[model samples]
Target: HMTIPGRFMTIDKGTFGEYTASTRWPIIIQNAIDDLSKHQETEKSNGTKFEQGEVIKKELKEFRQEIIDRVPLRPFTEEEIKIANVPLSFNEYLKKHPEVNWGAVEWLFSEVYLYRRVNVLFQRQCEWAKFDIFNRLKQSTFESSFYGVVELALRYENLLPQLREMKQNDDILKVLFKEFIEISLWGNATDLSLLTNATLEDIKSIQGAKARAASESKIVVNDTEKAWEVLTKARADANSREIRVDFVLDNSGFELYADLMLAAFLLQSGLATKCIFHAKDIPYMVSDVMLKDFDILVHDLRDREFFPSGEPSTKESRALDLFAGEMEKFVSSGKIEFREDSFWTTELDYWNLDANETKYHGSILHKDLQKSNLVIFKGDLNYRKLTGDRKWPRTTKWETAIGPLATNGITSLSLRTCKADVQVALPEGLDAKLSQEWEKENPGRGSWWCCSGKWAVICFCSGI
Candidate 1:
């Protein structure tokens, strides 16, 4: 009831969804459990809080078991539903698929529910109500990204003035736009959910200009030029005032930093007058942006001791300080606005964007987006949601795959590193050729390249 009609939704059995459901999610839940255990022991004799932590841990362990055992998902408790605070379509989907178990449920719905349910376990406890189960992981991962953080800070600090000066040149604007956009694209490669066991070195390898330049060829589909035209055309139209660009955000920390750089670039270039940042209202998908996460990022950037890599040179410190100050100016001046909505955390697919008949808030979100000259969707999950996580043919036109979002008169750009099976907008024969090339390196897992984070796609859908 919640998905595109003709295409099959990504589900279990030999798909990446199966691997993620079976292996990845369990680890995420277990990490929460482990963190809670350690958190409970932080004090000598905090009886009530410790006891509450234990209860939450037990609930988490049980939740993990249910997924492993393929238990049929129970309907959300009234309390859970109310606390989730959204116009949810969960029960509707549950009613539609009464027989479906966690192992068998639609990948998109089940995975989204997993995080929401896990959050409820914490919210129900007085001791954990405001706690972020994944805060430590998010902060620590970002801290480990010292090199990436310093590099971008320096680059942005150096480039901002020059970009402001050269805004009149279309030639420089095109090149600069692609450079910043690609940085934002490659920033997704470090998604903590996909790299659960990532070491400091592993995280470093995927960041910085060197890594970005090296991975340029890995972008399998590029619609960046189309996106450029949209922005440039908007700028050319004298009637287009308050040229707003919206970022439907993804992971936090380094990826979020990259996104801010892109937003700052757009504003400096005069291509956009305002930037609206849409973040999840609740803790989401392990490392998704929440309002607090944004606060934490700004705060951390100013703290010299936040990064464990010791003190930096005066230049490095000054660059980060300058960059953080600029971000603050943007927020204070209303040039960049950070907003949150429960609609992001709900189970509805992107195709529902025009479904005013339903309570999923899609039409409302669509209305909000209609004002945007361009809406940039960051990272893989947004891409999956944009395409309904369906098994569309690899060469399927992007417009057809995106359903209503394509026709809703809202120009959207998906900057996604391919991390799942629902790839679209590929030219004919490209998938086969890429799969064959992948097979030579990965042996039997050629088709798995679509799910590999090593490749990416910059897909832009121009709404009518």
Candidate 2:
């Protein structure tokens, strides 16, 4: 039914290994090393070590060296397979691509294998198997954005009043829907840090909207109107005031903060009755949100000793207090919830999101996602999987490129900032212009353009 290349190539399958191998990955590995040390310290102090801590500590340091030195990507061990069934897929992926390695293999799978490798170091340690090494660093990095966190807290505090006042008004609800959608969309710039300190003024300034509009450029391919229509239509049919929206989330820290803000806004605005965040089953892709991350945000914001607001309200937990309290209420009341699925962490692309796939959980996930009014996929990784990380032309219609999901009868909206090289449904020549300008400035780095996280897309596929 389509003429565009069925499988062109994504970042992992091509020549641009710099972003994964040389850049973000090395830093991620170092952070893991540091986190492992912290875990070792805590565990040693408490006197709990299944296998000696120093054993894995040395292994982690060498793991970092292997990555930078561009060593061959290896297969998951039998012990790892026993610890988690997910590694079976990793080894299966390697067996199929016997020639694949660190610098030479496909980008996505290798990076995934890299993280799986990190998990093994900890998994082998009896006491450390269940620990999160990056927790301390993730916490510190998130705390640094205390200003933005408080700013949103203040903004949410102000906005909720309007939400309750206009609960019955569809027009008002739609407006809030668009506003929060963009906030959650642009929140994916590289890592999930806040855009500015002027949070309240910025919202009025149409900060999230205008900011990405001029700099990254506005929704290059918008199916937002159609997505909004799904919500209203679903409401009319269901006769219930609540519509559930699911987010396959990304990044923790500030990104998670923004996501929570948007989730709360959707519930309060009545655009959504329940908001579900589909987080990673593992600590993945550096900043990707996990269930524990929800707890971290809730726990850290309330305790000044954990992460104090550097603003006037520091005397008491005014901003974060108001923020965390509302969040906790929503959480306890079941307005906001976080869940995880292992299918997200596998090496198999989302084309496997099929009913008959034996090696994956796509069948159940496929059926589960069908139950939602809308499923919002956040960030590059999810976007990549959605499109099968294919080599479609920039002009390929989103519906056609997304293949099965286009006809699967589930409204899907992808809120992605261009971080990976794979993209679809772009205006003609847009990729050329972006690549030309970026390569012109940077020289010999055409592929780097998409990886910059400056441009974004809000493409939608109607559930047929």
Candidate 3:
């Protein structure tokens, strides 16, 4: 195993971890309780489920208060560990840092533990085991994103024919590749967990072509050139083997749409023969994709009433149908895949993605990912795990931050909108400059800039 570095802790005042632990998490927990309560109201007939729901709600309310009170973190009970199928690695992690509390613990561990703990409440009862409390929020938020959805659907419909005609034009493909990847990257900006109070207007403002074009300068680190080189070389070198691209996906809704477009572009343009989408098994981080969300996304797009603002015209309807049809065709033909594993839901950092680690199936996933020409990790949480949520100097090399994955033959490209403090591969003095600029506008909270979701990074490492 590789030696891991120190992690960002919530106790560190003025850091994003502290803000998340003290402020953001409580709201999320409250939302979970409210969502459950809302469901309870609608399902009054099922006595067993109704009672279980009340108990879960009570437990979540307690958990929320415990977090605010800074209560000591408790290891999962035996029943929780088994019933929830929580990885023992979490208990092992808890043991290594005894007495740590929600308010003052490793940011990654505590945040993941918060979600895992909440999940156990649901898993305890057979009636509520598979219910996604966050589904309403996920669907509703995405549904309200009418402009972004229709915009992309039309763009995809228009671009597909043109891209196919220019298939031989490497320059055009390269430029479009960067553009599509940027769309996927910025799609992370609408993360439901981060935008708790966002209105439909607020959500619409962050998307569409104008927003994406304006955001180009906000990409602090750009490595699309290197990522493109990896794909081109793999295509040139792959004789008998298929070029596969794996997406360690983030967010559902519009973000998922953007990711789908990027994957569709690669496959249609003959850059990759297959695309594997790895999604979370449990409802996670408010807006993360589950296997079911894909169905919901396609379904929502086809439903005229899903977006409340306006009805789709005939052209819009045809475009939506065409996009969904192609996506279904890809899935049915095995060009696109959906995969899930317990490893993704655990608190352990991606540094543990090695052949020796068996607790969370990291070894199995490691071997599978090596088969990919490029494994694109989307959004901020994946970026945090890639770097072990460490406190590396801003200018640290990305290869140094990602540890074993860099040398273990897994080429990874991270497309993340800045949302946490764990950022790296910055130019020297860039952090200071940004921090100063941030303070001028935000007063005392200079570091809040990275967590703002206004900035982004596209970092690539060729695992050679």
Candidate 4:
């Protein structure tokens, strides 16, 4: 367990002060209560599964109370892990933090435990095992992102031609790749494009060098070029056919949309021929991608009614119908795949990726990722697990932070907008300088510039 890493950032500290405190943490418990309450309302109104909703509502209340009361952590049974092979991980974690309550425990496991324990109530019930209590919220959030969604829906049409032709020229290829990568980075942190046009040039002269340089300044630990090297080499090798690029996805709504755009560009530009998305099997982190979410995103994209269809938006801007149509072909032809495994939802840190006989999924992921030309791990949570959520010096190399996943021949890139304390492999004096700047500005705060989603990293590690 990474619990001993006191050097690491903890929510108990004002890490992401607003999010970890008054805003995100509070909403997490409140939202479950609200969601369960809504579930009951819907069941009563629909007259279907009303009694089932009753059980879920009552159970959710107790689970919510567990968080409010700040109880000690509990252990998972061996039979509970998909791998009857489940390790004594959770209990082992609790042993380390005994006599502690939820509010004061290690940040990572405490949050993960909240979701996992709540899920237990549903799993134990027959009719509710497969139901995602959070599905409606995911759908609603995606729908609420109409403006960003529409922009991409329209932007992709303009992007398709440039993306496809970039394969013909390296200079433009690199430029567009950078733009798309930033499109991906700034997505949470900020979104992007190629072959400057009338509508495009307005965007930093429409994706021109000056604008690119501006965004380039934001990345503190840049390994994106290294990742590009991996993709470019794959495209050059004659033996290579379809370069399989994998995405270990994060957030569900607009973030998921941005991720798909990056994947689509990789394929369109011939940088990759196939894309694979690894999604969580359960409702996780409030907004993480689940396999079924892929379907919901597509269905929404296909339906004109999913977003605004009046003055500012339409069903056929740049013929979004055409864009989603061609995209579906990729889905159908298996050029793009979203798949899930029980491993992602487990309590273990990714350090277990090398545990062949000990952990179930990490070993499987090691084997599966062996064939990937590039594996992109998205967002902060994945970054946390990648590094075992350990306390490491900010200057520690990202390659070292990920531990076994780095040493186990996992050639991957992380597109993370920094959210926690585990900053690594940054420029020599960057963190020190930022620390001074933040304290100078905030008066009493420590170096928290890295904790905000305002900064980002495109850290790449070529596995051993």
Top-TM-score candidate index: 3
Global lDDT for candidate 3?
0.83
Assess each prediction's global lDDT (C-alpha) against the native.
Answer: 0.80, 0.71, 0.83, 0.72
Best by lDDT: 3
- In candidate 2, position 185 carries an lDDT of 78
User: What tens-digit string does per-residue lDDT give for candidate 1 at 1-464?
Assistant: 45444333335456777778889999999999998777666765567777888888899999999988989988887877776453457777889989688767788988888988887887788877888988889998888888777767766776767777766657756756766788788784543322221222322343433444555678888888998998888888878567899999999998899899889989988888899999997788999999888889988888888953345567678778888898899999999999987788888778777746357667888888988989999999999888888887888888988888888888999999998877888988888998998889888678878888889999988787
Candidate 4 global CA lDDT score? 0.72
Better of 2 and 3 by TM-score: 3
Task: Report the number of clashing residue pairs per model.
Answer: 0, 5, 0, 6
Q: By lDDT, highest first, what's the ranking?
A: 3, 1, 4, 2
Candidate 4 residue 72 C-alpha distance from true site, Å: 1.3
Query: For model 1, where is the 10-residue window of minimal lDDT?
Result: 193-202
Q: Between which residue pairs do clashes occur in model 4?
A: 8-391, 186-190, 200-206, 201-205, 201-206, 203-206
Put down candidate 4 lDDT per residue, 1-464, tens digits, no spaces.
55345523233465653246335665676687688777666555443366666776777777667666667666767556552323356667778767656656666776676678767766766667777878778888778766666666666776667776776657666766777787676663343332232133344354467667767777788887898889999999989577999998988867787788888888888899999999988887888899888777777776667764454345444445665676688889998988987677766677776746254567778888978888898888888878877767777877778877777887889888888766777778888788787788766555778876767888888887
Better of 1 and 3 by lDDT: 3
Candidate 1: residue 141 lDDT (0-100): 87
Question: Candidate 4: where are CA atoms >4 Å away?
Answer: 1-23, 45-48, 77-100, 188-210, 310-318, 355-357, 440-443
What would the TM-scores of all predictions be? 0.91, 0.87, 0.92, 0.87
lDDT for 310 in candidate 2 is 53
Q: Write the per-residue lDDT of candidate 2 for residues 1-464, one digit (tens) a residue.
A: 35645432223433244455667677877777677676666544444572456677688788888877767667777767877555478777778877555555666677667777777777767776777766777788887776666666766776667777765556546655665677677763422222442344454455554653454344567666888888767766746666988888888888788788888877776667898888877777767788999888888888776666656455335767888888888888988887887777887676666666666677888787887888998888888878876667767788877877888767789988877767788788987888898888878777567667777788887768
Give the TM-score (vs. native) of candidate 2. 0.87
Judged by lDDT relative to the true structure, which candidate is superior, 1 or 4? 1
Error of 3 at 132 (Å): 0.8
